[PDB]
Design a protein around this ligand. Structure first.
Ligand SMILES: CCCCCCCCCCCCCCCCC[C@H](O)OC[C@@H](COP(=O)([O-])OCC[N+](C)(C)C)O[C@@H](O)CCCCCCCCCCCCCCC
Lengths: 128, 228, 368, 38, 55, 339
């Protein structure tokens, strides 16, 4: 069974930081591309970042380019997101998402309203 | 007897082979186009300018048949049914100039899909007029969603329309170079991208598609002779 | 020899019948009276000029393409040889270069045989490959096969002519109608080869330059042009040669009647040259639109021209002038013959063995 | 007028070989073009 | 939604109350079936030419 | 909150199910069949090459007679072949050219097909005028039709990209049962030998066993890592095999309620597009994105042969009810019969 279980997050004051984790099981973690997505209150799903199978290729959305950091540990089957200088706009539920197929360059549907290879996100609230 | 059954089966096969020969003439002489939208892009208005899961609109340019298909009543998960369009002449990608970033991720998926690697994409950066008024007012900025805009300068290959202020010219050219970065990074001579600065109502849209398709077919012919 | 002496006497009679209606010397100054040396025959000339005319074919070593020379002194009298003080004409150049020319002709003969044999083998292999693989089949492949077949037929006919007709002088002496039929077939096949080159040019130009969109060509006109049309000029030339210039087995190339066939071939090849120019222009503009690197642009537009040259037969258009200089002329002869005889091999190699689809299909089939 | 086009090259070569060469046989001494000859 | 979680729980209860057999017993039956129908499998035991309609 | 309790309780049941399955696994299939003799190299040859479709083939289905078969191409045509003679019998133009599945009624009187139009179209082959006309148009799915199989001349089960499966009553146009529970696009379905149950594979990496009459999911099978693209019942109906985008085929036992064997190889890196069993079930045939088809020893998980005759991805395959031949379709527009 493909399982993704995100941890971390919670209430943090503005200008703080957080460390999100995603524990994966049920598939060969080392041959899949990974993504972080979020869903702000009263809004749709938005892509955050992704990391290649070996971790060499990384990309971020414009709003978090210099603030967020995505990392993976293949040996432990875990994905990371380091969030720094958090501002109130960052409050949302963050989901750990796996690309549909292994050894693939493209990554479809990870931001769809319903997607099977996505965990139950972790609430991140940035407020005073 | 059996010899009469086999004779009948040959006549039945022969008659079907005749219709298929004519069926192949129409199919080969018509170009199929997939119309794709990133959301609120204005493709519906463009279509108006020329359970059902697919819509069709047939139009003629210089005696040339064109067949354009729009997806309806299909879920947002495209990774399965997108494979059907691996043999179309080109994919028309309509985008409203963070929906823009979303449109960029969908274009990268389409460009780098193993089944769609040889398929060309015509890109319609739609709603130039809407971007103009928003850019002129300045209440909203592209810097918040794309920090690289600060260090971007209008290309020396830019051809702004007469009466276009420099601010809007940079904005529309910056968005164009976002899609071009993805397209040039891959597609080693197998497929090409045709950007266009368009309005949802301009009559020149169908002429643009006709010119882009002709270049695509010309390049395919040249590649079959190993000339290009 | 006897034939040569007979031709000498025929020429003697010809310019003995000459001098009819004797004119009067024009201008001023002494003039050299018309005379018959014994081989050629000179007309009225003034004092102090050098006359020219082609060398006769009386002797085997005489080269007709050379020029005889005759000088009338400024005193009104012809050249008097210093050794014997008798009227003398310069016939030395008629056979001065014959030995080396024959030595080179032997090499050219063997080169042509080798080139046509290799072309036959490689083109047979390519045609077998094309027929064998149905997947590779298409309208371009359909025309490629016809071109290959015409190449093979032309090469076989040329090999037979070189090995059985040219060295067998007794057969030509007999002059049977059999080699007349053979010559008819040879001319027809040569014209068909050139016109199939033209057909390839026309289809390629109509796929890349004009009517690119949704274009499915009707091959019927290509079959008519490649195979049917070359039969008209060949028939006209055959009739004219059977009427005006009938000779022993129609092997002579000294009749202006060969232009009946070669002219239209030259026009078709010039049209193919213009097609090549237009196609290269279109390719250069396509590379420019993408902003291709200039060095890559030139390399690619030179590779395209080089690969198109064998297909469209452009070597028959860009080699009109043979330099007079002996070394340059020898190099020209070698280059032209190498390009001509090996053209089929070049076409087969380029369009069958280097084709990506052919290689991929062959490799995938080779598993079993 | 002869056909001097490149298409006639092979024909001209064959004709020259037939004429000059003694049926692809032994070499003959050259013809005389000396002072005593015309 | 909350309805989906209740529907999922109801389904999981149904799947958890079924009777299961040992894998060894299940594997043996699969082995027995293959052994019984082995002689009737044209693709497993090739059929002599002139006996298959695709010769 | 109640959501956490429901989510927490669901995790509690999954642990219970896993424990029960773990208790039944006293011995693996591999060691049970370790002492039996190998199948040996099986070499098959292409006996027929069916040509005539203009575009890539998406689905094919053998008739119950083991001679006739139907193929669907995206050119907008349905072709019914006579495999023995290679002659074409019917060329049915389609209103929509984006067909994705086709089915041959077991009686041989009807054929069905569907695709991006979200409609299942049934065609009457035995019309009084001899021509083939569309008899019924089944609407109601909100997604493309992926698979369909006739139960009889008046009932048909479908799978749709809308994540649901439906049972239809032909000649009324209404679906009498809807099979919900999958979260991703349902990609393939397979009817049990007795027709009482059927299994479906979806894009959520899970396969579900359904009760046709009752209309509820009886079991759910997991173990694949990616989308399931093909599914097929074992001949005796007590097991089934699936093909996935993870480049592996797996065998599941209904009574043991768990996976039994995984068929994979290091050199196999592409996805599986179709799957089928041999007459006795000893052999498992799978089509692959890499243009090839592999023959697996179902009992021992060894690879026994390969079919390599296609120039494009293999999209479908099937074994005749008599087991005398196997048909394979490809995007290269050709169909091949292997024996
Ligand atoms: C994509 C790759 C592109 C590659 C393109 C090119 C690939 C192939 C290149 C082949 C090059 C041609 C072959 C070598 C040069 C031509 C033959 C050569 O001139 O023959 C040497 C000959 C010279 O004549 P000569 O000596 O002055 O005349 C003696 C006269 N006297 C007999 C009266 C004494 O030497 C001969 O005398 C010896 C007899 C045989 C010569 C070679 C011919 C053998 C028969 C050929 C049969 C066909 C072979 C086909 C091979 C493909």
């Amino acid at each position: 069974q493909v399982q993704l279980q995100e941890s971390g997050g919670g209430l943090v004051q503005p200008g703080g930081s957080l460390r999100l984790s995603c524990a994966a099981s049920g598939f060969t973690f080392s041959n899949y591309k990974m993504n972080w997505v979020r869903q702000a209150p009263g809004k749709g799903l938005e892509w955050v970042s992704d990391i290649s199978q070996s971790g060499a290729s990384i990309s971020y959305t414009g709003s978090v380019k210099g603030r967020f950091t995505i990392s993976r540990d293949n040996a432990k089957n875990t994905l990371y997101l380091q969030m720094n200088s958090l501002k109130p706009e960052d409050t949302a539920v963050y989901y750990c998402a796996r690309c549909p197929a292994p050894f693939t360059r493209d990554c479809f549907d990870v931001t769809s309203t319903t997607y099977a290879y996505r965990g139950q996100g972790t609430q991140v609230t940035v407020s005073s | 007897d059996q010899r009469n059954e086999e004779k009948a089966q040959r006549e039945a096969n022969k008659k079907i082979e005749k219709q298929l020969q004519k069926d192949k003439q129409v199919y080969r002489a018509t170009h199929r186009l997939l119309l794709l939208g990133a959301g609120e892009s204005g493709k519906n208005t463009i279509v108006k300018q020329m359970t059902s899961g697919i819509f069709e609109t047939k139009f003629q340019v210089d005696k040339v048949n064109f067949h354009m298909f729009d997806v309806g009543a299909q879920r947002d998960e495209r990774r399965k049914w997108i494979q059907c369009f691996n043999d179309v002449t080109a994919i028309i990608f309509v985008v409203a100039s963070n929906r823009l970033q979303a449109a960029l991720k969908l274009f990268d998926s389409i460009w780098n899909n193993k089944w769609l690697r040889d398929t060309s994409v015509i890109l319609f950066l739609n709603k130039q007029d809407l971007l103009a008024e928003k850019v002129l007012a300045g209440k909203s900025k592209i810097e918040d969603y794309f920090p690289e805009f600060a260090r971007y300068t209008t290309p020396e290959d830019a051809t702004p329309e007469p009466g276009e202020d420099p601010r809007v010219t940079r904005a529309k050219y910056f968005i164009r170079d976002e899609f071009l970065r993805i397209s040039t990074a891959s597609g080693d001579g197998r497929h090409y991208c045709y950007p266009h600065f368009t309005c949802s109502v301009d009559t020149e849209n169908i002429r643009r598609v006709f010119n882009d398709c002709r270049d695509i077919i010309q390049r395919m012919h040249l590649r079959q002779y190993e000339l290009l | 020899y006897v034939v040569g002496r007979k031709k000498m006497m025929d020429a003697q009679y010809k310019c003995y019948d000459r001098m009819q209606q004797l004119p009067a010397y024009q201008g001023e100054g002494p003039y050299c009276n018309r005379t018959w040396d014994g081989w050629l025959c000179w007309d009225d000339t003034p004092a102090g000029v050098l006359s020219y005319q082609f060398c006769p074919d009386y002797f085997p070593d005489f080269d007709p393409s050379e020029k005889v020379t005759k000088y009338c002194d400024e005193k009104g009298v012809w050249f008097k040889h210093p050794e014997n003080n008798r009227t003398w004409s310069n016939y030395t150049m008629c056979n001065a270069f014959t030995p080396e020319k024959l030595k080179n002709a032997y090499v050219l003969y063997y080169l042509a045989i080798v080139g046509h044999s290799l072309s036959i083998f490689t083109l047979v292999i390519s045609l077998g490959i094309f027929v064998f693989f149905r997947s590779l089949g298409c309208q371009r492949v359909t025309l490629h096969k016809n071109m290959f077949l015409t190449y093979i037929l032309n090469s076989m006919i040329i090999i037979i002519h070189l090995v059985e007709v040219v060295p067998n002088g007794e057969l030509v002496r007999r002059d049977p109608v059999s080699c007349k039929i053979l010559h008819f077939f040879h001319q027809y096949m040569m014209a068909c080869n050139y016109f199939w080159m033209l057909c390839e040019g026309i289809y390629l130009h109509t796929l890349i330059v004009v009517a690119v969109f949704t274009e499915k060509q009707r091959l019927r006109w290509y079959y008519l042009l490649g195979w049917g049309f070359p039969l008209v000029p060949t028939t006209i030339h055959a009739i004219t040669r059977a009427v005006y210039f009938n000779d022993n087995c129609w092997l002579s190339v000294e009749t202006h009647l060969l232009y009946i066939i070669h002219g239209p071939v030259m026009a078709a090849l010039v049209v193919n040259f213009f097609f090549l120019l237009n196609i290269v222009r279109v390719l250069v503009t396509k590379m420019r639109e993408t902003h291709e690197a200039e060095s890559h642009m030139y390399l690619k537009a030179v590779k395209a021209t080089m690969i198109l040259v064998p297909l469209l037969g452009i070597q028959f258009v860009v080699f009109p002038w043979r330099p007079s200089n002996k070394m340059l002329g020898k190099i020209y002869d070698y280059v032209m013959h190498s390009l001509i005889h090996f053209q089929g091999f070049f076409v087969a190699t380029i369009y069958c063995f280097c084709n990506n689809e052919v290689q991929t299909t062959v490799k995938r089939q080779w598993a079993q | 007028x002869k056909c001097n086009t490149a298409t006639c090259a092979t024909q001209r070569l064959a004709e020259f070989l037939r004429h000059s060469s003694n049926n692809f046989g032994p070499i003959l001494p050259p013809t005389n073009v000396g002072s005593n000859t015309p | 939604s909350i309805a989906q979680a209740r529907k999922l729980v109801e389904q999981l209860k149904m799947e958890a109350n079924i009777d299961r057999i040992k894998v060894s017993k299940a594997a043996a039956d699969l082995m027995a079936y293959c052994e019984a129908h082995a002689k009737e499998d044209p693709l497993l035991t090739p059929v002599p030419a002139s006996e298959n309609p695709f010769r | 909150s109640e959501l956490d309790q429901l989510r927490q309780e669901a995790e509690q049941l999954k642990n219970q199910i896993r424990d029960a399955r773990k208790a039944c696994a006293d011995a693996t299939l591999s060691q049970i069949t370790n002492n039996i003799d190998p199948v040996g190299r099986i070499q098959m040859r292409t006996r027929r090459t069916l040509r005539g479709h203009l575009a890539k083939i998406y689905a094919m289905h053998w008739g119950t007679d083991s001679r006739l078969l139907v193929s669907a191409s995206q050119d907008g045509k349905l072709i019914i072949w006579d495999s023995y003679t290679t002659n074409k019998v019917h060329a049915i133009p389609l209103r929509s050219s984006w067909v994705m599945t086709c089915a041959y009624a077991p009686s041989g009187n009807y054929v069905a097909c569907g695709g991006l139009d979200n409609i299942c179209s049934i065609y009457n082959l035995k019309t009084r005028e001899g021509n083939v006309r569309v008899s019924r148009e089944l609407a109601g799915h909100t997604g493309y039709l992926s698979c369909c199989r006739f139960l009889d001349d008046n009932q048909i089960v479908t799978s749709s990209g809308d994540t649901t499966c439906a049972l239809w009553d032909i000649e009324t146009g209404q679906q009498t049962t809807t099979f919900t529970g999958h979260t991703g696009d349902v990609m393939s379905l397979s009817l049990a030998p007795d027709t009482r149950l059927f299994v479906s594979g979806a894009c959520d990496a899970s396969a579900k066993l359904w009760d046709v009459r009752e209309g509820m999911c009886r079991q759910t099978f997991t173990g694949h890592e990616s989308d399931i693209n093909a599914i097929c019942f074992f001949p005796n109906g007590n097991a089934f095999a699936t093909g996935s985008d993870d480049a592996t085929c797996r065998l599941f036992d209904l009574r043991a309620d768990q996976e039994l064997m995984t068929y994979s190889h290091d050199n196999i890196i592409c996805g599986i597009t179709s799957v089928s069993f041999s007459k006795s079930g000893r052999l498992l045939l799978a089509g692959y994105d890499d243009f090839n088809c592999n023959v697996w020893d179902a009992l021992k998980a060894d690879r026994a042969g390969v079919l390599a005759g296609h120039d494009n991805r293999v999209s479908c395959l099937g074994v005749t009810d008599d087991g005398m031949a196997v048909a394979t379709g490809s995007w290269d527009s050709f169909l091949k019969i292997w024996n």
